[PDB]
Amino acid sequence: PPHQSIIIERMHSGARRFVTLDFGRPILLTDVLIPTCGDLASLSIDIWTLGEEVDGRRLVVATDISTHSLILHDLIPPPVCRFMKITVIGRYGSTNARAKIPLGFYYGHTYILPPEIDQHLAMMVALQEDIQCRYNLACHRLETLLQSIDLPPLNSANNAQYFLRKPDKAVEEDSRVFSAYQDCIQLQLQLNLAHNAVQRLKVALGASRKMLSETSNPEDLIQTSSTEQLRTIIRYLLDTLLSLLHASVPAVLQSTFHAQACEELFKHLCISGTPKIRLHTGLLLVQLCGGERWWGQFLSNVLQELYNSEQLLIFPQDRVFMLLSCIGQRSLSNSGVLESLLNLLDNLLSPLQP
Amino acid sequence: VSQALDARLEVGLEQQAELMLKMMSTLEADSILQALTNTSPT
Amino acid sequence: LIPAHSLAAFGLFLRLPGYAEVLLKERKHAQCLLRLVLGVTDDGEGSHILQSPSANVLPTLPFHVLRSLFSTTPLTTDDGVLLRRMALEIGALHLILVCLSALSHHSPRDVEQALTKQRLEEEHVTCLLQVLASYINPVNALPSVLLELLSQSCLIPAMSSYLRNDSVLDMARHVPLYRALLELLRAIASCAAMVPLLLPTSVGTLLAKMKTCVDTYTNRLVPDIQKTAEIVYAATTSLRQANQEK
Amino acid sequence: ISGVDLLVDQPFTLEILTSLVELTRFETLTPRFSATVPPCWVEVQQEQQQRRHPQHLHQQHHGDAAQHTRTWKLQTDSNSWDEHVFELVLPKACMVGHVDFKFVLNSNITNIPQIQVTLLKNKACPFLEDHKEDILCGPVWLASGLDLSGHAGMLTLTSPKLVKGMAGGKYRSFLIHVKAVLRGCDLLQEVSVTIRRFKKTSISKERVQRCAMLQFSEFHEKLLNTLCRKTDDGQITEHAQSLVLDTLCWLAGVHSNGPGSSKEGNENLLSKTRKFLSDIVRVCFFEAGRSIAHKCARFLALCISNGKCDPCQPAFGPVLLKALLDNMSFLPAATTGGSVYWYFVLLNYVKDEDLAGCSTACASLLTAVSRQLQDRLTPMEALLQTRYGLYSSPFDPVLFDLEMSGSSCKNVYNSSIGVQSDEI
Amino acid sequence: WLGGSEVNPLWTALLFLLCHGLTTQQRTAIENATVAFFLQCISCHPNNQKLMAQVLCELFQTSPQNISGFIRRLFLQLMLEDEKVTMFLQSPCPLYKGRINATSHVIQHPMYGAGHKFRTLHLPVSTTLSDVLDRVSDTPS
């Protein structure tokens, strides 16, 4: 995906602006996104293929873009286009400083169907194979790069000094790792896009997907799906759980989320998941079981297990510590949170007393 | 949410569906912001 | 199985027997060329090839290594003649003349960027003409197809057009291409097989025209490059005159 | 009717569906129209509404669309009118599909005007009482067409008996009558009305074909069967499925405002929808693509609105809830992220019924999935997350979605644009 | 022994398996393992280099019909890059350069020893000894 904005002239905002966009080929435009533009009063899109006066069309006019960003998630039926016209009206006051117009993003299919289909599918398959080979090479480079580095445990003053002031070789190796990872994710996204396009073209032949022709038992479905699909499902499902809780009295929900369930859910989500699902899991737990008696003892057990000097699991200690602090602040009304923490601190200092 | 919707007057009036389909999401996004920032667990 | 034409030539050149060994004499670029082929366009260390420290020389490697091969592979042994053949069938020399037509605009029959592209194009055609000259001389010998394929071709129009430019100030700065021209005329006059291809404004008359013109301009009326240019030009012109008469 | 093979009778094929959508295809009146207004309104000049809309004539050279935006500004006098009469003129014979009734509220309005536009069907002391048997076509409520902003909107004017017309798609009388139930109709600021019709088809007796489409319920049964089942002989392409969703969407839209008499066909379709709702959701979300999911979401929105508009018949929300919750366990086997997004968008609204069951299923699915996810973590990814805070796993080739900002665009290319300055 | 006549058929069978009941992750793991195994066998053994060259040549000759698939990546990252060799030093004087005070864990064969009097580097064969000296010790730098 390309991205680079362009400059304008006669920066005064009172007058009209004109931008015309052409893809050089008919495009099955189906998605348009333009960020919020504060110094702007109006925005419109005009669409044509053969000519502005021959087959010109318009599809949306935006007015509140000053504090908002228009989103056209799914344009159905997909308008066939090659030429796109942008017309915006800046702030009514014609006095303004230098500003850059955000172009936005536009997604759509390049190949149009109601023949090229067979050879287009063949060349797309070849492109997918080449992208897969390049992605495999990038994965090998990243794997052999990370294999040579290590994270010192935060259990000594020397490691603390290392974390405070990274040595130069650590900085350069981190830069190399970040570059390799960025290349790997770019190639991964390209491969996924190519595979999706190939799948769509194959669907155009009527060859529907396998779609559970072997089994339908959930214990295999959950253990055969992809990791990213599971993450997306968890994010949406946790979001819906939060919405359901905010809309109330679901007494059944509090019954299932007992001490063991809370332990397992926390250890599975807040330790290994993405920051969004980690924060959402923490907030759901503190909203559900915040008032429980066993709560607080939960926090003490979690802290003692995770931050023990004998812990071997690798996890982002600082982020989960911030999450624990946020949960403790929210669940502060419970009397057991500080009692359990002080009892834990009482036991750690026990060797001082003979 | 920007309340901006494409010019589908010309097509059959699915627009009232599209507004409320847009409204389907809006009553969800605000509640979550009210769920996590607002309504501190008490 | 930048520039695009060099990579195609590299793919065609590498099919020639013995070209793999000579290409591997300077190993790291040879790896870069092979890595540039197959589409990865990257090194093993994560640095892009087009921003490699010695990326400037990259276009020259195919033709230059082929020239080194031609110097190291004479026409005397069976190796030279078999190489000439498998050059002729696969269109290696045919694609050589085609890309010469593309880079010289002689069909068979922005200031800074303009000068930069002119420089790269003239150096590329210099290398192409010089490797063709090395193809002419060892250091059915003449191909049967070459007899027909030099008539209504690009080589004679290329020589004519590049001999149209007779600027008296040209050779002061245009030394490398004129050195290649001197070497190729040496080959075209000294090679026994190449002589009938030329001998049935004529090439000899206008060549003598430049010789007399430069003699009047300099001899009648310089650093190392220029003085070597004139002395070698005079010697090679005398040799070409001796070869032309018979 | 006799001697013409109705499109419903023949077994469904791709070209048959393509012909069917042509009937549902809809266009604009090119011929000129006219209208009259009560004296309390003054017609707003056509270029005044072109204030922010400078290229109306360029797209269509005929310019009737510029006239199509017939705008009247309300001159609020001391009278608090509770009724109004709007006369329509149809000079060129045509079959109107629906009348585009657009209303915008005043910028300072803070209350909810209980303004109602009720128009009973035609058969041969407010006008709705004295001429209760003489009203023309509807009925609707203003709040139904109220948009997100709450200061504007657009009402739908259609009925299953509207397409037939007075006799063979003629015009005799169309009256847009409004009655409210400062205060009343005076809150409304201005009104624009547009008349738009069906596209001409290459099919003989388009009126007869449309009548056969709308009347018979076995057509609905067959359409729902085709959408639901995907058998060995039913190798139905998703192109045909998209056409089917379009047909049902148009059918539900035209059945939305059907009166009590027309509720026979509405209930005939909705009974089959309730019979096959689980399969509808399963196919159109967990098997089809994102576009089919959007079409199914639109159809389900129409069904929900129809159930709301007909309190005399059971609502659709709880049944949709049971369908979605029964299809919940198939989420790990879903195809695309956009379909799951639309599924959860629909699911979130219908949480108002049976919160306990939805919460129980959500908790069960979360507990089942979470244990599996932790088992797939690798020391490589853990090192990445801890040292650099990079959470996306690079060694997993397969992704699920790409949510840039409030959108799911994994199934489509990113378009590379060469910017042309052109007009500066 | 890996170049012995008993093990020679394994190379061709492996290439046959990887150039056409395997899941995607299984295929990727097998590809990586095969590349590592071949690179280990080729590292500094001219005889095994000749055997792999012969296997590649015969596979290319007998391959019907464009180059792609696992064989492309294997050729591109097996050759077309500098060979790596494990180089092992030792001295009566300590070698401090390259060490940090962090508690790094490095586990190698016991023959390479431990402490400041030993050092092992996995570095390309194309490097010169001056690079070794100024990367292992501060004094040359």
State the SS3 of chain D. Answer: CCCCCCCCCCCCCHHHHHHHHHHHCECCCCCCCEEECCCCEEEECCCCHHHCCCCHHHHCCCCHHHHHCEEEEECCCCCCCCCECCEEECCCCCCEEEEEEEEEECCCCCCCCCEEECCCCCCCCCHHHHCCCCCCCCCEEHHHHECCCCCEEEEEECCCCCCCCCCCCCCCCCECCEEECCCHHHHEEEEEEEEEEECCCCCCCHHHHHHHHHHCCHHHHHHHHHHHCCCCCCCCCHHHHHHHHHHHHHHHHHHCCCCCCCHHHHHHHHHHHHHCHHHHHHHHHHCCCHHHHHHHHHHHHHHHHHHHHCCCCCCCHHHHHHHHHHCHHHHHHCCCHHHHHHHHHHHHHHHHCCHHHHHHHHHHHHHHHHHHHHHCCCHHHHHHHHHHCCCCCCCCCCCCCCCCCCCCCCCCCECCCEEECCCC
Pairwise CA distance, residues D410 & D401, whole Å: 5
Residue D307: strand pairing partners: none
How many whole angstroms from its chain centre is CA E23? 26
Contact A273 D373 (CB under 8 A): yes
Q: What is the DSSP letter of C196?
A: H
A23, A197, A250 member nearest D356 (Cβ): A250
Q: What is the DSSP letter of A331?
A: G
Contact C31 E76 (CB under 8 A): no
D chain contacts of residue E24, beta-carbon cutoff 8 Å: 397-398
Pairwise CA distance, residues A346 & D23, whole Å: 80
Chain A with chain C: Cβ pairs closer than 8 A: 9
Query: D10, D183 in Cβ contact below 8 A?
Result: no
A197, A228, A243 member nearest D413 (Cβ): A197
Pairwise CA distance, residues A28 & D49, whole Å: 31
E chain contacts of residue D398, beta-carbon cutoff 8 Å: 24
Contact E82 C35 (CB under 8 A): no
Task: Take residue A203 and report the two structure tokens written for it.
Answer: 């669907």
C chain contacts of residue A130, beta-carbon cutoff 8 Å: 39
Task: Take residue D283 and report the two structure tokens written for it.
Answer: 């196919």
Pairwise CA distance, residues C206 & C192, whole Å: 22
Nearest alpha carbon to residue A322 among A269, A282, A264, A266: A282
- CA-based diameter of chain C, in Å? 60
From the CA of C52, how many Å to the nearest CA of chain A?
17
Pairwise CA distance, residues D112 & E58, whole Å: 83
Contact E101 A162 (CB under 8 A): yes
In angstroms, what CA-CA distances link A123 with A117, A119, A198, D90?
A: 10, 6, 10, 55
Contact A179 C39 (CB under 8 A): no
Pairwise CA distance, residues A32 & D417, whole Å: 13
Query: A62, A102 in Cβ contact below 8 A?
Result: no
Compute φ and ψ for A198, nearest 5 degrees.
-60, -40
E66, E67, E80 member nearest C31 (Cβ): E80
Query: D180, D114 in Cβ contact below 8 A?
Result: yes
Q: Count the neighbouring beta carbons within 10 Å of the beta carbon of residue D369.
A: 23
Strands D70-74, D188-197: pairing kind: antiparallel
Query: C176, C123 in Cβ contact below 8 A?
Result: yes
User: What's this structure's resolution in Å?
Assistant: 3.0
Task: Take residue A74 and report the two structure tokens written for it.
Answer: 């799914």
Residue A107: strand pairing partners: A31, D414
Compute φ and ψ for D344, nearest 5 degrees.
-75, -30
Q: Which residue of B has its CA nearest to A31?
A: B6
A chain contacts of residue C39, beta-carbon cutoff 8 Å: 130, 134
Task: Take residue C12 and report the two structure tokens written for it.
Answer: 């065609």
Report E:6-35 residues touching D (Cβ under 8 A).
24, 28
C chain contacts of residue A176, beta-carbon cutoff 8 Å: 46
C209's CB contacts (< 8 A; 6+ apart) are: C166, C201
Residue A247 burial by Cβ neighbours in a 10 Å radius (0-12, 13-18, 19+): middle
A130, A176, A183 member nearest C39 (Cβ): A130
Does the CB of E73 have a partner CB in chain A at under 8 Å? yes
Placement of tokens 């006051």 in the chain: A93
Compute φ and ψ for C196, nearest 5 degrees.
-65, -25
Residue E114 burial by Cβ neighbours in a 10 Å radius (0-12, 13-18, 19+): exposed
E chain contacts of residue C23, beta-carbon cutoff 8 Å: none
Strands A80-90, A40-48: pairing kind: antiparallel
Q: Which among A131, A132, A169 is the top mutation candidate for probing chain E, defined by the most E β-carbons within 10 Å of its own β-carbon? A: A132
From the CA of A190, how many Å to the nearest CA of chain E?
17
A32's CB contacts (< 8 A; 6+ apart) are: A45, A60, A70, A72, A75, A104, A105, A106, A107
Contact A62 B35 (CB under 8 A): no
E46's CB contacts (< 8 A; 6+ apart) are: none
Chains touching D by CB (3 or more pairs below 8 Å): A, B, E
Query: A254, A246 in Cβ contact below 8 A?
Result: no
From the CA of A57, how many Å to the nearest CA of chain B?
10
Does the CB of E103 have a partner CB in chain A at under 8 Å? yes
Q: Which among A7, A68, A146 is the top mutation candidate for probing chain D, defined by the most D β-carbons within 10 Å of its own β-carbon? A: A146
E chain contacts of residue A136, beta-carbon cutoff 8 Å: 28, 31, 73
From the CA of E69, how many Å to the nearest CA of chain A?
7
Residue C165 burial by Cβ neighbours in a 10 Å radius (0-12, 13-18, 19+): exposed
Q: Which among A154, A162, A227 is the top mutation candidate for probing chain E, defined by the most E β-carbons within 10 Å of its own β-carbon? A: A162
Query: A89, A39 in Cβ contact below 8 A?
Result: no
Q: Could you tell me which residues of chain A have a Cβ less than 8 Å from any Cβ in chain E?
A: 126, 129-130, 133, 136-137, 139-140, 143, 150, 152-153, 156, 158-159, 161-162, 167, 169-170
Residue A55 burial by Cβ neighbours in a 10 Å radius (0-12, 13-18, 19+): middle
Pairwise CA distance, residues A200 & A206, whole Å: 10
Contact A69 B2 (CB under 8 A): yes
Nearest alpha carbon to residue A335 among A272, A286, A293: A293
**Phi-psi map region of D224: left, alpha, beta (phi>0 left; psi -120 to 50 alpha):** alpha
Q: Is the dihedral of CA D214, D218, D224, D229 positive or negative?
A: negative
E66, E76, E126 member nearest C40 (Cβ): E76
The 3-state DSSP class for residue A25 equals: strand
From the CA of D34, how many Å to the nearest CA of chain A?
25
Pairwise CA distance, residues C70 & C19, whole Å: 10
E35, E102, E105 member nearest A159 (Cβ): E102
Query: D403, A33 in Cβ contact below 8 A?
Result: no
**Long-range Cβ pairs for the range A344-350 (8 Å, 24+):** A344/A300, A344/A303, A344/A304
Chains touching C by CB (3 or more pairs below 8 Å): A, E
Contact D305 B16 (CB under 8 A): yes
Judging contact as 3 or more Cβ pairs under 8 Å, the answer for A and D is: yes
Q: Which among B1, B2, B22 is the top mutation candidate for probing chain A, defined by the most A β-carbons within 10 Å of its own β-carbon? A: B2
b/e burial code for range A90-129 (CB count within 10 A of at least 16 → b) = bbeeeeeeebebebbbbbbbebeeeeeeeebbeebeeebe
In angstroms, what CA-CA distances link A87 with A61, A95, D46?
A: 9, 19, 21
On the CB side of C50, CA atoms within 13 Å amount to 6
